Amino acid sequence: VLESKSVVPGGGAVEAALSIYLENYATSMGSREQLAIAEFARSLLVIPNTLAVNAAQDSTDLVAKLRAFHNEAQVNPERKNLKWIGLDLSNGKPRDNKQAGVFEPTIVKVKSLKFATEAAITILRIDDLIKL
């Protein structure tokens, strides 16, 4: 918080807000690229699964209900029963930021998404390992 005053409300709430935002972008783009963006969007959804796992919660139930609270894409403590915001590490319920939601810093979220893309390209590339 002290280094970078810019921080981001939501942990698994951002990822799920982001899943529809990318797909909204995907519908507008059209062509071959609409499906590629869509699949990026499905992988954001692992984040709400991984926390469900640690909590011992249902995974599929847990992401569904977070996307159910929606107006526009934007995460905020203003609404939680009509917009995404927060999680808990022991429940899938949304929470406000004066309550018990999760936040992340800006830096931890931008560096992770990116790093994971450069990795995704490298493993996908190969079509050998064989002794020539």
Added chain:
Amino acid sequence: QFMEETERSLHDAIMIVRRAIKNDSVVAGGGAIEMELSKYLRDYSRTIPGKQQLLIGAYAKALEIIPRQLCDN
């Protein structure tokens, strides 16, 4: 061999135009409607679910195969 399909064209013509008289409501062909329903069911998929998202989205995806296959083959 050519006649077999040309007969089928005239036959497809008679059925469908008749079925147009009978049900005067007519929508766009081409599998055009289905892409809009995929999208419509995708919008509701977002709104509705306590677990329903996987299954309503399955219904939506399912629609799109029908014109997509004709492109693909």
